[PDB]
């Protein structure tokens, strides 16, 4: 048969050599072309164990995205370790592209085809793949953007749902569009996000139903972030190379018991940012002139459940979580594992 191994994977993409876009440039040197005819072999009478929380593929992807950001981003001032460095900071072309991770000779990638897979333990429908699907290395907090959807219903994933210190990764089964804009010409840093109120609330109702399976007959509440760095208290993301920080209170302010307008999120383009790649602070130049606009698909979310008792009881509170970018890579790499053919 096969044994679980930690092999050095290679990458493949549809990166364009003519592009000045940062992800395309990195992938032109680090990656090979995407397999025109990729072969998937569905395995009969095979049950294999997978563990998304202990997946070495996450670590390799994390290393690649850190290097991509480090060699691509141009901050005016960088503070690391008590020392500061000033350099030229021209604006860049930034838009993630899908990246495939491929197994070398003597190795294979096993894929979990169980539509309801929780993230750990056995899986009955397994297939051998040469490469993973195309993964966009999206650096965002609270909401997972431009990822893959759950095939059947919404899937709640946690290493242990009963442990409040463990992150909850929600995978949606239908995309929720998020339209973000910094209008053309007043306050150059003022921006906003639009989300269909009815679509988001119905999504929240279905997330509450899936959460209630682990918290029987309990009221499910969504509340705002309890605190932390601006990167995690707010929904943070990239759009046209600019760092957007959105107040997400309106997205997490509902109570769900056993039973078309827009949500306008107030946003700010920040210049002083706390780095995720390493411990430090980075400063960028003011935003570019004109309309800064991007549309993204919310395909998942990161939640933390409130610890301790409540005065009333019978109610569990969930708040947007984050802090570790490995959980964003984990949300896409959950169905794969590296195995040695030998």
């Amino acid at each position, epitope marked *: 048969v096969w044994k679980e191994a930690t092999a050095t994977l290679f990458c493949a993409s549809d990166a364009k050599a003519y592009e000045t876009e940062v992800h395309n440039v990195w992938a032109t040197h680090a990656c090979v072309p995407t397999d025109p005819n990729p072969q998937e072999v569905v395995l009969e009478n095979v049950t294999e164990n997978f563990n998304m*929380w202990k997946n070495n593929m996450v670590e390799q992807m994390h290393e690649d995205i850190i290097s991509l950001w480090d060699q691509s981003l141009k901050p005016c001032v960088k503070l690391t370790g008590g020392s500061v460095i000033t350099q030229a900071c021209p604006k860049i072309s930034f838009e993630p592209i899908p990246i495939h991770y491929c197994a070398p000779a003597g190795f294979a990638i096993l894929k979990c085809n169980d539509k309801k897979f929780n993230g750990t333990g056995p899986c009955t429908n397994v297939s051998t793949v040469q490469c993973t699907h195309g993964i966009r290395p999206v650096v965002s907090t609270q909401l997972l953007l431009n990822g893959s959807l759950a095939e059947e219903e919404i899937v709640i994933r946690s290493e242990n749902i009963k*442990d409040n*210190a463990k992150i909850i990764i929600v995978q949606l089964n239908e995309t929720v569009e998020i339209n973000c804009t910094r209008p053309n010409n007043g306050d150059i840093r003022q921006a906003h996000c639009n989300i269909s109120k009815a679509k988001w609330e119905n999504t929240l109702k279905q997330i509450a139903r899936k959460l209630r399976e682990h918290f029987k007959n309990e009221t499910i509440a969504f509340n705002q972030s309890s605190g*932390g760095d601006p990167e*995690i208290v707010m929904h943070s993301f990239n759009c046209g190379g600019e760092f957007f920080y959105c107040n997400s209170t309106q997205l997490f302010n509902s109570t769900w018991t056993w039973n078309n307008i827009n949500i306008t999120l107030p946003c700010r383009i920040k210049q002083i940012i706390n780095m995720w790649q390493e*411990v430090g602070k980075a400063m960028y130049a003011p935003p570019i002139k004109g309309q800064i606009r991007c549309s993204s698909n919310i395909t998942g979310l990161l939640l933390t459940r409130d*610890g*301790g008792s409540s*005065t009333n009881g019978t109610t569990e509170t969930f708040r947007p979580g984050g802090g*570790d970018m490995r959980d964003n890579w984990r949300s896409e790499l959950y169905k794969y594992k590296v195995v040695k053919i030998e």
Partner: antibody
């Protein structure tokens, strides 16, 4: 050796605010959460919440929400606990605690093998 | 979310005797036992219901029988004097006092 060094005892007036610190060493501060556990005179142990040095993410029980703030200084590997509008009941020994199991990729928060000496806080008129 | 019921309130014994501490919980979660000596921080004794923590001698044992968890301290020493707490995640029992002296 994992070490949790807590700040000196404090004497506070009813209605005042406080700031307690916990300076860590012997491990990578970034790796796991810091917990705060209090003990009122002649009473049990009470968890006040956790704080993750990676991003400063927090988790507070309902009773401490709006009155407790847990933060950190990455440059000195120090965790801080802030508490507002102090009451006589808030008189307790405040401990910082860390779980036994902590690696660069995994941790279990709850098995508190590592504790600071505790910071006595006396609140009175 | 989890109430942990400790019994008895106080145990008054002599060195060399056996102490039997009880903790009741109807909930899932890895159970820990702590020893807290006067004026000191608590010390982890047992974790995962039955495993001994660093530097804990074999005379300290943890066991589980459904909702009933027990910490047994065989061959009691004067240094075993203190309050013992059980724990599941963020929840603690009210403690059991173990009185032992020279």
């Amino acid at each position: 050796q994992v070490q949790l060094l807590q700040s000196g005892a404090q004497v506070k007036k009813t209605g005042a605010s406080m700031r307690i610190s916990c300076k860590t060493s012997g491990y990578t501060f970034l790796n796991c959460p810091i917990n705060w556990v209090r003990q009122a005179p002649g009473r049990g142990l009470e968890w006040m919440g956790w704080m993750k040095p990676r991003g400063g993410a927090v988790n507070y029980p309902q009773k401490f929400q709006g009155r407790v703030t847990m933060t950190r200084d990455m440059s000195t590997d120090t965790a801080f606990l802030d508490m507002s509008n102090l009451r006589s009941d808030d008189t307790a020994v405040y401990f910082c605690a860390r779980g036994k199991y902590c690696t660069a990729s995994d941790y279990y928060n709850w098995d508190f093998e590592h504790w600071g000496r505790g910071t006595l806080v006396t609140v009175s008129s | 979310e989890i109430v942990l019921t400790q019994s008895p309130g106080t145990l008054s014994l002599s060195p060399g005797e056996r102490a039997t501490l009880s903790c009741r919980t109807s909930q899932y979660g890895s159970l820990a036992w702590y020893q807290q000596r006067p004026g000191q921080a608590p010390r982890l004794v047992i974790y995962g219901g039955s495993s001994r923590a660093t530097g804990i001698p074999d005379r300290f044992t943890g066991s589980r029988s459904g909702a009933d968890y027990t910490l047994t301290i065989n061959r009691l020493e004067p240094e075993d004097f203190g309050i013992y707490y059980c724990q599941q995640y963020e929840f603690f029992g009210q403690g059991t006092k173990v009185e032992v002296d020279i």
